[PDB]
Amino acid sequence: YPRFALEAQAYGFICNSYIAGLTSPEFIFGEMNGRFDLINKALSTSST
Amino acid sequence: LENPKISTFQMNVSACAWYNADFDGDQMNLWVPWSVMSRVEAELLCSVRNWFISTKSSGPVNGQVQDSTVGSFLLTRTNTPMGKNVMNKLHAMGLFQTTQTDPPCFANYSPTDLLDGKSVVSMLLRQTPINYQRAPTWYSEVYAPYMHYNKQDISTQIRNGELIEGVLDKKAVGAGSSGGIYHLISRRYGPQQALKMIFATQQLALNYVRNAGFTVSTADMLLTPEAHQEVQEIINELLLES
Amino acid sequence: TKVLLTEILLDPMYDYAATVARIDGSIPMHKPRTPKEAEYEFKTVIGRTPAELLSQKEFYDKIYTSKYRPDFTQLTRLRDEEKTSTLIYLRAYELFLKYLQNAPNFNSELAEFKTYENAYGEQKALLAQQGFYNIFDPNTGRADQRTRLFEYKRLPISTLYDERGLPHKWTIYVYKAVDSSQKPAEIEVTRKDVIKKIDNHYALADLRCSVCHVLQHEVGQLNI
Amino acid sequence: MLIPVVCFTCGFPIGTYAAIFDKARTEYIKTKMGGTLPQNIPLDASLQIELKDLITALGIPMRVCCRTHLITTLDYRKYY
Amino acid sequence: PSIMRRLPRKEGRIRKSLLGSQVWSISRSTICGNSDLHLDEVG
Amino acid sequence: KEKENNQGLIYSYFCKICGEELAHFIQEDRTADVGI
Amino acid sequence: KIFQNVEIKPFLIDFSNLFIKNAAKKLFQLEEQLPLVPVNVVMDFKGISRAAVHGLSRVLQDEIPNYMLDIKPGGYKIEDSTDLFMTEQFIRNRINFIPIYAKNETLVFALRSLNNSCEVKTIYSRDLIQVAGPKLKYPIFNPTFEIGFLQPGKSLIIEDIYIKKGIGRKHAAFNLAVKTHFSHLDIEQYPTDKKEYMALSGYKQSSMTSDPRHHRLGLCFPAVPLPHINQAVRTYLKNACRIIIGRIQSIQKIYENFEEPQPELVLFSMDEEKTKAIITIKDETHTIGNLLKTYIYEMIPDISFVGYQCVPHKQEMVLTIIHKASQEDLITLLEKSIQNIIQTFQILEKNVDELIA
Amino acid sequence: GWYCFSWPYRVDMNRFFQFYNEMPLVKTIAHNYVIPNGLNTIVAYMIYGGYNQEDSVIVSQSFIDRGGFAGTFYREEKVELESDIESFGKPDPLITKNLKPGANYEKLVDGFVPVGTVVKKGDIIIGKVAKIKYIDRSVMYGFDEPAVVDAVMRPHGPNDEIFGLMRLRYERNLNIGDKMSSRSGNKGIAALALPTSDMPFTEDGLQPDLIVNPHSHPSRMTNGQMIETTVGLANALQGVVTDGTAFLPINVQLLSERLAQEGLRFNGCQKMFNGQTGEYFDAAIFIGPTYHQRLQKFVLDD
Ligand SMILES: [Zn+2]
Ligand SMILES: [Zn+2]
């Protein structure tokens, strides 16, 4: 995405569903949120 | 387990709520008390019946999980895609051949007589009659405009153990459901009696599915071509406002 | 003698030379069962007695050399394929033995045989294909490109706002009778009143805005 | 390491038509391969290699499991 | 190595030998599902 | 070694006359190896 | 006439295909059909409960005695087998699952493969030499199997390959029949191609209510000689019948000894003149239990309860029968039901003998 | 899977060599560079007795006996000597001291157990005594499951001295408690082993190898596993292997219509019967080939 992009897709808006498949930028944004689940799950043991 | 090829610690799935356990590869310790003093206290204090009611949230811990929650819904459902949800005498007796409780009496039934799921559930709840009346998880006003709910499935009522109407699901038989069926049995008949009814009602739910079936497929997830155009037309409105 | 035998019997070079000797029958196909058979295998493979290996100084000079000397110049691509496999195996052994002995004119022949074995590997990979299929698009003549992905499209502003500039609030459900005899023909209810006024004799036709009172499917009749 | 003697699912004697199914398949691929390197066959994006009629001619029934295991089983001789 | 180094951390004297314990007559294995067992029973 | 094992790992010897436990052996102490 | 309209069809190689023809002719020099071929048999049953048909199917699948090829301990000669990849486990797993049609338990084979070449040599099943027993006038297994493969300069010597008998339930190598069809001909079906009905089974009656008594069952046998197919399949069918009868007769020896204290039969006298019978039999499957429940239910329409609970982790079948009669009358009814089962399978025997010429 | 193509030449610790491997019916571009590891097990997505609840699976016993996910598991024993103090040999009861209770020294041959014999718990696999009359520093096989001595050798270490190397092999089948997984990350533990006559079967005779709970999907949204079953079901009948690499153009609506063109249903579900009772389900069950892989977590070691 270009610098100072205005479209909502550039900021994590995934327009597609799982049954229809995601594109490369949508999968990267999904991995950004998916990695947080793995990180917070690890912290949910030690920090607790 | 007399089978020499079994090396695992097997337990009921409804007992996982005590340990926050699942069967993805978890390992659990087990030691058998041998001292008389420790063996006495295991039976009287540390028995799992003493923690059917959570000491944390003051509510029940155990219930139906993932097959007797949907199994109880199908069993207590009023209408089946193949007509009314009834069964003959032979298949009504087959639901009680695994519960390990004393069988009911089916002598007042011809082989061609039909029994609905409410009657079958009632014969098991007569042992511990309770009073319950709530709205099941099946009913949801989110789904209401786009669904034709059955008026006999959105009101679960039990008086003196007789399931008058409604379906049994997470609200009534689910694990951790405060005020549920097994919470009322424990308060009136003891936590050990509630555990036996969890197992007993689990078998009817599982025995019903033995020939009713339950599956998930890829077409269960596929929008129709006309509905797909409606989904992106909704998303285009969001991108238009954005 | 024991330490020498233990060292050499664990050398993969010894096992490979022993396999080559077994192929043409210089040593028995079965591994030795008695020390005499082991000594005979050592003498045939290494080429020197363990007693006399400690007396002199070389080691690689007299290791087995296959009996049949096929013509590897037909490995120049030129009952042919199994013979080619046999030539590949024999030349691999001969070149490995030359590498051990630091034979002159070695790197060029190594490169030539590596090219030959790469061609043989191409053939072997041809033999190792399960197959492949592509779901062709009937309209085209190649891999299907049709997808159910989202495609952006600038909808008219009439879909979000009415002719007075207010936003739409689609919150009235309009139900029409499946059969004609049922009356009334249509019922307009709110989400709270669906369970109390709608039965299976009705079907959801369209939504309605609670502000401008227009059907969602008739939103295009507004002047943009 | 080879095509199983019997189907893993039901136990139909797949193995007795295994070897033939291997070799014959190769020529069929050679018929449909086309100006392409062997190791690039699963990336051609233009191939239509169908083995339905070959397995049918072998006499194997139209069972999903049997044809799956016959087609998809790797051979250790072809990689080592 | 020192005497007082044995105390502090998790693998120390207090948290590994006193607050915790290695015991005999104990078993461990992977758990499994069995719908024929009661909730108060273990296979 | 008449009985290779009774499927139960034991670290102790027993008397052949009555069965009483004589003593137990797990590992050699091996601490006198550092002498003077 | 319970069992009528049977049809038998072998599974043969189509030599009209050039690829298969060339491959077979250059591999095994094969130009005609193999000595042993699979056979699909479709059977129509009328006036019989689905419990009996399904029990017959189960017995033919993995409860009928069957023969395999096994290696005696010490047969795999480590002294001579120099191959590093053809381990004993792999090779014996290959050998156990070769479908055989044996005549006696005396045949002993041997596999002696020597690789004097420079290329990997494939060990087929035609390299199994019979070394003990009477000489075979007809092969007992197909010669086109792939037992293994030897690296150059390697060997594989295996002796004492004998014929072992067992039931398919204990080990899958004794499995006999593979399922190919099962349907009820007295129940109508929806067209499931339509999207309205594709989520349903298809039958117009729910299994909770339907009681079909006209079935079609089709089973495939993996190895049957070409010139004696009708002789083999018939035998198989007949065999199954005897097995079931035999097992049923075992229960018939329990009820006959209800006076003496017997561990496998327990009788209680409940309230309201009700009697209870518990029959616990070890190493029984759902076949016998389902047959017993179905025939007791048919014999006593107004029975209070009947169930055949077969427990996986207990390896036993517990049949509970509660009825409002006395102990003697209940035992009489149970014996009558057992006799009904016996006569039904005797009629099946007779129909099998009558149909397949 | 095939953990190494030169496994017989190696003496490795805790290594499993699965005999049978299959290329997935829906393969990817990653299989152009590495060997696939797993089998195309026929999987039924159904509720069957409640033994597959809470991420468990039901495994056909016949599939286990035929070699499904079966292989050999290896362990090694590396024992060293003290130069001129210790030695390899069978001890004698009347001279050597503090022999291990309940041991079995009779299986030793010249200090090592011969290759091909079965060593069980309590057996002395390596004989070793230190000369003081003698003290017994023997090595005993302390494992519950019996092993087979696969390879014995006496190499020379970096210090030019003999040490004992023994390779023990274990015949491992798939048993209850072994962990399996799909390619979508839905792992599971084998819970029940049913015979070939107790598994459910379709009208056409198809029966599952694994029975997984349908409740494993909705919370984890592993849609690629369900699409793989739909695509792979048509590939088997069509006799083809297709590519399912990520980010390739797919249309599940078109893939579902491809099933009907092959004689199946649009949804891929089929009429099935209960193997224990012979009673058909009142629902078409989604059954098809899904590529499953055995994770190397053995209950016989944990
Ligand atoms: Zn408006
Ligand atoms: Zn199959």
Q: How many cross-chain Cβ pairs, B to E, lie less than 8 Å apart?
A: 88
Neighbours of C193 (CB within 10 A): 15
Could you tell me which residues come within 8 angstroms of residue G275 by beta carbon, excluding any fewer than 6 positions away? G267, G268, G269, G322, G323, G324, G325, G326, G327, G330
Residues of D in CB contact (< 8 Å) with G are: 1-6, 10-13, 15-21, 23-25, 27-28, 53-54, 56-61, 76-77
Any idea what DSSP says for residue G80?
Answer: T
Can you read off the two tokens belonging to residue H15? 């290594």
**β-bridge mates for residue H15, sequence order:** H74
> Alpha-carbon distance H74 to C59, whole Å?
35
Which among H53, H28, D76, C60 is positioned nearest to B13, based on CA atoms? H53
User: For residue C18, what is the enclosing H or E element?
Assistant: helix C12-23
> Alpha-carbon distance B235 to A8, whole Å?
12
Residue H42 and residue H208 in contact, taking contact as beta carbons nearer than 8 Å = yes
Q: Please report, for residues B241, G117, G157, the alpha-carbon distance to residue B235 in angstroms, rounded to integers and kept in the order given.
A: 10, 69, 71
> Alpha-carbon distance C192 to E1, whole Å?
74
Annotated catalytic residues of H are 55
Residue G123 and residue G148 in contact, taking contact as beta carbons nearer than 8 Å = yes
Q: What is the 3-state secondary structure (H, E, C) of G192-242?
A: CCCCCCCCCCCECCCCCCCCCCEEEEEEEEEEEEHHHHHHHHHHHHHHHHH
Any idea what DSSP says for residue E17?
Answer: I
CB hemisphere CA count around C214 (13 angstroms): 19
Chain H residues close to C144, C-beta within 8 Å: 249, 251, 254
CB hemisphere CA count around B149 (13 angstroms): 25
> Alpha-carbon distance G342 to G241, whole Å?
9
Which among D11, D24, D21, D28 is positioned nearest to D70, based on CA atoms? D21
Q: Could you identify the residue written with the tokens 């029409």?
A: C176
> Alpha-carbon distance G284 to G344, whole Å?
20
Q: What is the 3-state secondary structure (H, E, C) of A13-26?
A: CCCCCCCCCCCHHH
What are the φ/ψ torsions at residue C143 (nearest 5 degrees)?
-55, 135
Residue H89 and residue H111 in contact, taking contact as beta carbons nearer than 8 Å = yes
Q: What is the 3-state secondary structure (H, E, C) of H150-193?
A: EEEECCECCCCCECEEEEEEEEECCCCCCEEEECCCCEEEEEEE
Could you tell me which residues come within 8 angstroms of residue E32 by beta carbon, excluding any fewer than 6 positions away? B8, B9, B10, B11, B23, E43, H56, H176, H177, H189, H191
Q: Please report, for residues G220, H185, H258, the alpha-carbon distance to residue G143 in angstroms, rounded to integers and kept in the order given.
A: 20, 42, 39
Which among G118, G82, D80, D77 is positioned nearest to C93, based on CA atoms? G118
Helix intervals (H) in chain H = 61-65, 217-220, 223-238, 252-261
Residue G42 and residue G216 in contact, taking contact as beta carbons nearer than 8 Å = yes
> Is G127 in a helix, a strand, or coil?
helix
Long-range contacts of C190-196 (CB under 8 A, 24+ apart): C191/B141, C191/B144, C191/B145, C192/B141, C194/B141, C194/B144, C194/B145, C195/B139, C195/B141, C195/B144, C195/B149, C195/B154
Which among C157, C176, C175 is positioned nearest to C167, based on CA atoms? C157
Residue B118 and residue B92 in contact, taking contact as beta carbons nearer than 8 Å = no
> Alpha-carbon distance D49 to C134, whole Å?
9
> Alpha-carbon distance G8 to G356, whole Å?
9
> Is H280 in a helix, a strand, or coil?
strand
Sign of CA dihedral G340, G342, G348, G351: negative
Q: How many cross-chain Cβ pairs, C to D, lie less than 8 Å apart?
A: 53
Whether E and A touch, i.e. at least 3 CB pairs below 8 A, reads as: no
Residue G93 and residue G173 in contact, taking contact as beta carbons nearer than 8 Å = no
CB hemisphere CA count around G283 (13 angstroms): 7
Omega within 30 of 0 (cis) for the link into C184: yes
D65 interface with H at CB cutoff 8 Å: yes
CB contact under 8 A, B27 and E35: no
> Alpha-carbon distance H104 to E42, whole Å?
36
H252 interface with A at CB cutoff 8 Å: yes
**β-bridge mates for residue G109, sequence order:** G130, G161
Residue H153 and residue H165 in contact, taking contact as beta carbons nearer than 8 Å = yes
Task: Convert H209-227 to b/e letters by CB count within 10 Å (16 or more is b).
Answer: bbbbbbbbbeeeebbbbbb
> Alpha-carbon distance G168 to H65, whole Å?
11
User: For residue D48, what is the enclosing H or E element?
Assistant: none
- Please give, rounded to a whole number of angstroms, the shortest distance from the CA of G82 to a CA of chain C: 7
Residue G134 and residue G174 in contact, taking contact as beta carbons nearer than 8 Å = no
Chain D residues close to H70, C-beta within 8 Å: none
Pairing verdict, β G121-124 and H201-202? unpaired
Which among G183, B104, B37, H241 is positioned nearest to D71, based on CA atoms? H241
CB contact under 8 A, D72 and H25: yes
Could you tell me which residues come within 8 angstroms of residue H214 by beta carbon, excluding any fewer than 6 positions away? B214, B215, B216, H45, H46, H47
Sign of CA dihedral C135, C138, C144, C149: negative
> Which residues numbered 8-67 in B keep a CB inside 8 Å of some CB on G?
10
Which among H128, H143, H121, H138 is positioned nearest to H74, based on CA atoms? H143
Tell me the DSSP string of chain B.
---TT--SEEE-GGGHHHHT--TTT-EEEE----SHHHHHHHHHTS-GGGGSB-TTTSSB---B-SSHHHHHHHHH-SEETTEESEEEHHHHHTTSSSS-S-----TT--TT-EEEHHHHHHHHHTSS--EEEE--TT--TTTGGGS---TTTS-EEEETTEEEES--SHHHHBTT-TTSHHHHHHHHH-HHHHHHHHHHHHHHHHHHHHHH--B--SGGG---HHHHHHHHHHHHHHHHH-
Dihedral in degrees, nearest 10, Cα atoms B228, B233, B235, B241: 180
User: For residue H242, what is the enclosing H or E element?
Assistant: strand H242-243
If 0-12 CB within 10 Å is exposed, 13-18 middle and 19+ buried, where does residue B15 land?
buried
- State the Rg of chain D over Cα: 13
Give residue C90's identity as a one-letter amino acid code.
L
Sign of CA dihedral H120, G165, G316, H279: positive
Secondary structure E strands in chain C = 170-177, 186-189, 202-209
> Alpha-carbon distance H124 to H100, whole Å?
9
**β-bridge mates for residue H167, sequence order:** H76, H151
Residue G40 and residue G220 in contact, taking contact as beta carbons nearer than 8 Å = yes
Whether G and H touch, i.e. at least 3 CB pairs below 8 A, reads as: yes
Could you tell me which residues come within 8 angstroms of residue B152 by beta carbon, excluding any fewer than 6 positions away? B78, B165, B166
> Alpha-carbon distance C198 to C202, whole Å?
7
Q: Could you identify the residue written with the tokens 């996982």?
A: B16
CB hemisphere CA count around D55 (13 angstroms): 25
CB contact under 8 A, G119 and C22: no
CB contact under 8 A, E39 and B6: no
Partner chains of C (3+ C-beta pairs under 8 Å): A, B, D, G, H
- State the Rg of chain E over Cα: 19
